[PDB]
Design a protein around this ligand. Structure first.
Ligand SMILES: [Mg+2]
Ligand SMILES: [Mg+2]
Ligand SMILES: [Zn+2]
Ligand SMILES: [Zn+2]
Ligand SMILES: [Zn+2]
Ligand SMILES: [Zn+2]
Lengths: 449, 449
């Protein structure tokens, strides 16, 4: 009966004030960890990318939603853990750029090669490098791309696009900023155009706006990218009902789920951070965004569906799921939105684990692209940046700060962060690794090449 | 039998700009991990603590001394890794206290009970709790307490003293700050007074200042803590020369090495971070401190001496080695000093893993008490706080930020951080755990009853 265990419960065992009451462990883990090491080939693989979700991020959400003594059933239930570096490179000098953006990190794990901030699917000499998704498709395995942001956004765009700037969303952008990728200029195409070319069996997210653009060149010139997709044989679903009415999704009739003109709506409403907020304003208690909707699929729903549709492929599948606004709300200095996103991710990760655990030959990895702004500080903190007091589950008050920018947004940060995994080859995240290592871990795991 | 290996080389394999160049791994870890798992009895415990050495504090130091593709021979060499929560308790209410102080955190691993920010060896009801050093010794083991700060500083004090306030260094303060702990008021003594009543085989570090303090009661009244020390049977040593002449360290000849009246010297020097310090001031290169001396033992040396003397004991031993000034320099918003202290510790961890790897039954643990202020930002960042640009091993510039306080120092942070281990029972630091588990783990590993 060999089965590989998942953390069924690492919430503080008892009375937080009593001796041993905060212990998350009830005994020796040597044996359970041994039961975790399996180098058998992984048939399927699921990568959960919490965008910007560093260790500070993870702690802040658990404290609020689960309380300090709590435990996320998803994000925290993964047995194997370590810390991987995610620095980028300077295009000019080729030297490390300690703090990456969204495009670069994505490139290095989807391709295995370090690039410069802003690059998608190419290195610093602008040479295209095949992405793991493209290689999985090549090897005949099913492929999935799911996110809560514009599909043209860095994280998901990286699995199917090769452009010198992440900013080249569709024709109009590409033409101007990536004339080398410009269709009407002999180039591969815009992010959106390349997305349509990659033909992943399952792709769900937002950013419908761009699909309203028309091609400057090629076969579907004058027609929109949406009109194209249909002509290309894609099944377009725009809401939860239609999303779940999907019986099959494959290379014949590929699914394209566009559930918003841009990024899908945030889960929790809350005010932004303010200068001297934890003192000059009362504690905040996030509340559900009424726009989240019954017509809008949630993260764990799209995730669930994609596994439902991809599990048909008898050879196996590669799926990426991205909790997109965690990072978007960290720049936004809106703790509530940042946290809601982490909770949402947690639920998707549970769905992943429920399946993986049952199937027995899957590799699930949950991690982030880079660390961010938010910092948990004392209640009476007097800081120069943005700060907000919040009423945690613990019925206590946690204060969060953002102190890495006087301008518009709060920047990403370069600290090394957590990466955890469960399943075949999960042993490859333990200890200190590098974000590119991940590409190889996924590669060898699937048995590619 | 395949006796536990240490992560030989996690540094980048080749040319970071090249595909797979930035990789850290060379194969599948599964098997190396399998020989790392041992539920056998740990004979000695060496615990290295970097005060305020979170993963950010760690990444920067690496980038600086080793370059991004770099690798810390000791710090990064620890095969088993995890993340662990270290919140404190609000005394009056019992509810969690997200950002802790060095005092509350230390007690958590030293006694396995969550207290309130300031306490030492006592709970929220001010009740005492036997410490790990007290249990090890009482079971027969040789014990050692080493640090770079005054020995009455929180991290080292928590192993030997039980008091409501860290401030109660010696007689004077205890009397007016910790009355019930005051010798006159029938208490067990000041921190330093208790340190003496404790009698650890080996005690090294600074703090000499409070030892001039003279007693107000007890069988050593009117006599200074130093006069008492000698009188009680201790052997004092103020420099490296005499520390090396010490061929014994036992219960009826304990060692007390006071290397400074206050905190020992920090390794490197440098300018403190300033407003727009990255934009207005030139980059920096840390200056090795001329005044550290060849007469003042280094952290690595103290560790080395400690282990030699502590190993003559057939029963086994428990040692705690502390990287004190990382927190102090992090508070001081002085990158270079913070960084140099993170390197100094790396050396000690090396010496520890050295003895350990050869010994075959030493559980080596390397972690921090809580997270800190420092954050790695883009070199072009306009931030609200203190920023400093550095000239790294990569021959590139790294920019550090400190913006969580408008007051005197940069605050601690409440993020969850790394915990790495090596040897029998190391499996217990993987995954999410709470800092108090460390107590229970160390106790079980050793076999204390
Ligand atoms: Mg993203
Ligand atoms: Mg300390
Ligand atoms: Zn990002
Ligand atoms: Zn971002
Ligand atoms: Zn501390
Ligand atoms: Zn401190």
């Amino acid at each position: 009966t060999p089965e590989m265990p998942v953390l069924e419960n690492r919430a503080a065992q008892g009375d937080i004030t009593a001796p041993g009451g905060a212990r998350r462990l009830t005994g020796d883990q040597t044996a359970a960890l041994r039961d975790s090491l399996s180098d058998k080939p992984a048939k399927n693989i699921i990568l959960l990318i919490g965008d910007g979700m560093g260790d500070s991020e993870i702690t802040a959400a658990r404290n609020y939603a689960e309380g300090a003594g709590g435990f996320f059933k998803g994000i925290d239930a993964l047995p194997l853990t370590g810390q991987y570096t995610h620095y980028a490179l300077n295009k000019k000098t080729g030297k490390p750029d300690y703090v990456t953006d969204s495009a670069a990190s994505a490139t290095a794990w989807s391709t295995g090669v370090k690039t410069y901030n802003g690059a998608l699917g190419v290195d610093i000499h602008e040479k295209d490098h095949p992405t793991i998704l493209e290689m999985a498709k090549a090897a005949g395995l099913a492929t999935g791309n799911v996110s809560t942001a514009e599909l043209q956004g860095a994280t998901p765009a990286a699995l199917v696009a090769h452009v010198t700037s992440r900013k080249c969303y569709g024709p109009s952008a590409t033409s101007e900023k990536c004339p080398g990728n410009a269709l009407e200029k002999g180039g591969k195409g815009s992010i959106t155009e390349q997305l349509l070319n990659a033909r992943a069996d399952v792709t769900l997210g937002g950013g419908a706006k761009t699909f309203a653009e028309t091609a400057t060149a090629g076969e579907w010139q004058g027609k929109t990218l949406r009109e194209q997709a249909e002509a290309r044989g894609y099944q377009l679903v725009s809401d939860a009902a239609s999303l779940n009415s999907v019986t099959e999704a494959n290379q014949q009739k590929p699914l394209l789920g566009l559930f918003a003109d841009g990024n899908m709506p945030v889960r929790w409403l809350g005010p932004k951070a303010t200068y001297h907020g934890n003192i000059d304003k009362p504690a905040v208690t996030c509340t559900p965004n009424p726009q989240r909707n019954d017509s809008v699929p949630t993260l764990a729903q799209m995730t669930d569906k994609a596994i439902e549709l991809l599990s048909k492929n008898e050879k196996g599948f590669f799926l990426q799921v991205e909790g997109a606004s965690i990072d978007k709300q960290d720049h936004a200095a809106n703790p509530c939105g940042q946290i809601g996103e982490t909770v949402d991710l947690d639920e998707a990760v549970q769905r992943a684990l429920e399946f993986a655990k049952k199937e027995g030959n899957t590799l699930v990895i949950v991690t982030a692209d880079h660390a961010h702004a938010s910092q948990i500080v004392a209640p009476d903190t007097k800081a120069p940046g943005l700060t907000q007091a919040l009423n945690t589950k613990d019925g206590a008050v946690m204060v969060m700060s953002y102190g890495n920018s006087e301008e518009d947004s709060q920047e990403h940060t370069g600290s090394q962060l957590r990466i955890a995994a469960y399943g075949p080859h999960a042993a490859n995240v333990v200890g200190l690794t590098d974000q590119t290592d991940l590409f190889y871990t996924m590669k060898a795991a699937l048995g590619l090449k």
